[PDB]
Nucleic acid binder design. Structure first.
Lengths: 257, 146, 171
RNA sequence: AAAAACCGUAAAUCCUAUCUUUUAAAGGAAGGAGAAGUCGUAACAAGGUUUCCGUAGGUGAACCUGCGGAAGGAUCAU
RNA sequence: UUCAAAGAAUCAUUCUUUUUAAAAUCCGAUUUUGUUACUUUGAGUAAAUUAGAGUGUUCAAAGCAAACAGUUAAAGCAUUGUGUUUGAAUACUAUAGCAUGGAAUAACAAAAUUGAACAAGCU
RNA sequence: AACCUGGUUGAUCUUGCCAGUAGUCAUAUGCUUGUCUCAAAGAUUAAGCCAUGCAAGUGAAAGUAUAUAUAUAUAUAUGUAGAAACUGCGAACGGCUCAUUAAAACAGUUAUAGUCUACUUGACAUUUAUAAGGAUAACUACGGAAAAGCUGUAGCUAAUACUUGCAUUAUCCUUUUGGAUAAGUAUUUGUUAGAAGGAAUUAUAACAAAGAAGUAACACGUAAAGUGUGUAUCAAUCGAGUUUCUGACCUAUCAGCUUUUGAUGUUAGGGUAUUGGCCUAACAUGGCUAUGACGGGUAACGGGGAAUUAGAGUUCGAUUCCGGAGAGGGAGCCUGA
RNA sequence: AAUAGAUCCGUAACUUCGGGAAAAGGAUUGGCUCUGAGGACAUUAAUGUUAACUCAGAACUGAAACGGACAAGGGGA
């Protein structure tokens, strides 16, 4: 048969997973869920190789069995569950909240987040659909189908999502002052306010994004994540603060200690 | 006068009595000609009138065969660089394209063409533009960088 | 079954490898006829049941001028756009020409407007003559092989004129 | 449920034709290599008949002869 | 088939900026004017491998770690305890495709057995 | 490290090849081998044959438990379990090999506005009820043969195996509140209007006809209401099938191929999950080709990749991973997403 | 004895290029219901009078057999 492959080779694992080459030849294939395998990572490596909480699959699973790991305040027991680009995960008894953000190099790193900001999660919508009764339901990048969205919300506008009530709070547009985050582009990891767009005739629309250091970089429209307006990032950024510090002048920063 | 085969053509999706012919502007920075807008012809495979939707690749080509019914042969001359001899190389291949009866096509005419869903086992392209050009010799022969 | 074992457009033959896969399938055809309304079901790929009809007598038929539809029973097939052996062996396709009883549509017309929404359409003398005769000509449009029911529409106008011109310079 | 018929997929076998790949084959006709053999003097000197080309014929062989060419000639020259 | 002139900055030079015809745009000024080849930039550029970062497996073949004070406490922060910093970046992923600046060099077209544009009247 | 040397001669200078030289993650073999780390290993040829043994099974809150065992106040209620079996899922993953394979597969680049999609997530639904019906295993008792992972009758019981079936909501009017109006999800047919995309016959809405499959007659128990299993539609997830464009070794002592037997396209229809000569019937004679078609050969799976590399290049790539193929050779089929 | 008439297709070695050749080798021909297509005479693009035997496809049907008798090459190396 040629059915769905139920294995993932270690060498074929995505680069940001960072799997040792000698630690076997199989990678934990993420189960079907809210996000794609390439742009999401499993709790296994999240808590074994990134959090360093566990050292083995068996101990990862016996941590997982207890309802102490919560994503969006929802307990999860799928061992290879795709967390996604942007989400809120919580560990209860030790009372910590991790928001999955990017890194300037372009990896996945959990970021410490308080309860208040954890209650404030953002989802980029993908498309809106009209159903029976002339009602519009919009699907986010998290595979989340939220019905009854604001009429002012557009296809590329992002919407504030509340975790408990599962409701929309406020929409953010794609304006020249819209602070965005490149999701899967070659310039992944750099935050920017966008400088302009170019509406091309039926091809991948590109946008030129302006950095804090006046660096202009072009990336596709299909892989951006509006994270707030020009006032401030609505999401607590990681230590690197979303500024792609250059490779040549990274070594001078690294060498002083 | 319009239907001669051992069947009938409906031009489905046009309506006949409600109202308030049929055509579709297909977009892509292109408008339907007035002749096709008002035309009495009916074709289920014409991009303007039929169900076929254009998407994929838009090419420009050289008309090779027009005597065939509602279909034309399109060749695309180009140069193929060779790494070993750092020189160019005249190389082509002719692809089939469905031509609506709206466009009056002559031999050797340059035609802009769009990709659609598989229309025949080979024909999967539709004409959108024809620019008149009196050629000399054979359309098998003249070489155009397009 | 499809997509191979066929010479290329140039005329050269593609020698066969990659022996036939299941997803190609290509199920055998069906020849729905007049008789008892019994059909089968065929498990399509991905658990998609298909209503396969091999014998049909009654279905739905729509008056397009009035935008209505009534359930009725077909009497016979009289023409198909495909080969004449099909109409000779009494088969139904999605572009066949069949005879439909005029009684239900006539009763609906008398109930709604009378006489032997958007009403007052003046109908046509030819269809009135066919109604007084009692049988009318209409064309099935639904696909009996897939949906398993023979649904059609009443054909009127210049297309009806063409059909009668090709039926009966004529024998 | 046994069983039968009909299109349909079609295993497998045989007829003819074509293509591809090895091998047998009585025998024939070649080529090449071997340390020296016999007969002849063909070419290298004007090699004792200048050599060579194409063609044709003759001869045991190298070779000979005719026709028309070349010097790579033995003539850069009344 | 569109030339050049004028101005600031390193050493004596080199380098940077503006315009100089016509047609539609804005009440003396607001700005678009072939196609392709070609050429410059980008985004999609799987990993392993490749060159290479950083990293003393006794060096190396390595691998992607580890380092930091700590015969047992100090700092940092939390309103008694809580370890910290980090690395897995970079270029490549055809020649073909997408977008992109383009003055040079190549071609193609419009270029008069006539074809135009402007103004007035007519439909 | 952008490198040369010996060999025609009495001696010389050339052309010219031979030989020498070094590398190979490139094979085999001879001699020799005190240590440690590291580790290719039946591809070449026989995709030949296989003895044997193993390689896919699965029950920890949670489907069915009088085979049976054990514990709490006393034949009473709970339990902890539990062989066999029914049921559910997987077994279509993985592993091996490279025979076939020459615009085919593969690689980069597109579409699917021409489709399907297990588990999972997120939204969510229409035409006897203090809870309905049969139909069967294991088992009991008689056997058959040498046996199969073989098997008959009698009897029975269950289940989340199989099958029936029990409100209410929305809309219009005087205008919180009273009346009246109507009740099909997918899917198909006929007649119209019509947030997005790039273009809809899109979403969706209206009318007239049909119209499946469900909306829990099921199981455990968390806040000092919960969970499992199952179900209609939509979106993503894990993918898959088709598909645009660009790219391949040698060969003309392969120049004309294809077209009744579909070749090239039109119409109509069948079939598929969907487009399509995929196929059928009719119609037209078309389509490719010195820019090498059609043939033939490859001791040719393709790719990133390997060796040698100053740059050009030349050769190799069965084989760590991707994609394709096969399970002695064809062909057919159930089940199952 | 074996087909042998006719139509459709196909036809090698060799050759003096003319042939070999009816090479070899095949299918069909039964029946009736059918259908269609192909000349001369007249009217201000068409409608009326009047004479052929050559093809083709859908049928079913008959005891799956048919140039039905007569009439007629056996081929090949």
């Amino acid at each position: 048969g040629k059915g769905i492959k139920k294995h993932l080779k270690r060498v074929n694992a995505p680069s940001h997973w960072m799997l040792n080459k000698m630690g076997g030849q199989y990678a934990p294939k993420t189960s079907s869920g809210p996000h794609k395998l390439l742009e999401s990572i499993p709790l296994v490596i999240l808590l074994r190789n990134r959090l360093k909480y566990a050292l083995t699959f068996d101990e990862v699973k016996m941590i997982l069995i207890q309802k102490i790991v919560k994503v969006d305040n929802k307990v999860r027991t799928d061992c290879t569950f795709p967390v996604g680009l942007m989400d809120v995960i919580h560990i209860t008894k030790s009372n910590e909240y991790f928001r999955l953000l990017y890194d300037i190099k372009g990896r996945f790193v959990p970021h410490r987040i308080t309860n208040e900001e954890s209650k404030y999660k953002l989802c980029k919508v993908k498309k809106i659909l009209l159903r029976k009764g002339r009602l519009s339901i919009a699907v986010t990048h998290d595979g989340r189908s939220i019905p009854y969205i604001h009429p002012d919300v557009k296809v590329n506008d992002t919407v504030r999502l509340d975790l408990e009530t599962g409701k929309v709070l406020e929409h953010l547009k794609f304006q020249v002052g819209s602070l965005v985050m490149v999701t899967a582009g070659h310039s992944v990891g750099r935050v920017g306010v966008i400088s302009s767009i170019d509406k091309n005739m039926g091809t991948y629309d590109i946008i030129h994004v302006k950095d804090s250091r006046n660096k202009v970089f072009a990336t596709r429209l299909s892989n951006v994540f509006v994270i707030g307006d020009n006032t401030k990032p609505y999401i607590s950024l990681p230590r690197e603060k979303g500024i792609k510090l250059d490779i040549i002048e990274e070594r001078r920063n690294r060498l002083k200690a | 006068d319009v239907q001669h085969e051992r069947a009938y053509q409906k031009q489905e999706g046009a309506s006949f009595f409600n109202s308030k012919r049929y055509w579709k502007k297909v977009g892509l920075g292109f408008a339907t000609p007035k002749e096709a807008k008002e035309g009495v012809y009916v074709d289920k495979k014409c991009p303007f009138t039929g169900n076929v939707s254009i998407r994929g690749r838009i090419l420009k080509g050289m008309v090779i065969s027009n005597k065939m019914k509602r279909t034309i042969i399109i060749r695309r001359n180009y140069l193929h660089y060779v790494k070993k001899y750092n020189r160019f190389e005249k190389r082509h291949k002719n692809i089939p394209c469905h031509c609506s009866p709206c466009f009056d096509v002559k031999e050797g005419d340059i035609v802009t063409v769009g990709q659609c869903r598989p229309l025949s086992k080979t024909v999967r392209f539709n004409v959108l533009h024809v620019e008149k050009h009196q050629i000399f010799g054979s359309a098998r022969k003249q070489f155009v960088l397009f | 079954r499809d997509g191979r074992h066929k010479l290329r457009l140039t005329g050269g033959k593609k020698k066969i490898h990659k022996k036939k896969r299941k997803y190609e399938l290509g199920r055998p055809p069906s020849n729905t006829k007049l008789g008892s309304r019994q059909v089968h079901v065929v498990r399509g790929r991905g658990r998609n049941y298909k209503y396969r009809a091999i014998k049909l007598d009654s279905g739905s038929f729509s008056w397009p001028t009035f935008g209505i539809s009534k359930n009725t029973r077909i009497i016979d097939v009289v023409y198909n756009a495909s080969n004449n052996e099909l109409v000779r062996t009494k088969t139904l396709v999605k572009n066949c020409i069949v005879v439909i009883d005029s009684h239900p549509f006539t009763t609906w017309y008398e109930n709604t407007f009378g006489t032997t929404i958007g009403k007052s359409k003046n109908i046509d003398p030819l269809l009135l003559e066919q109604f007084k005769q009692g049988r009318v000509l209409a064309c099935i449009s639904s696909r009996p092989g897939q949906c398993g029911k023979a649904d059609g529409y009443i054909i009127e106008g210049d297309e009806l004129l063409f059909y009668k011109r090709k039926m009966d310079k004529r024998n």
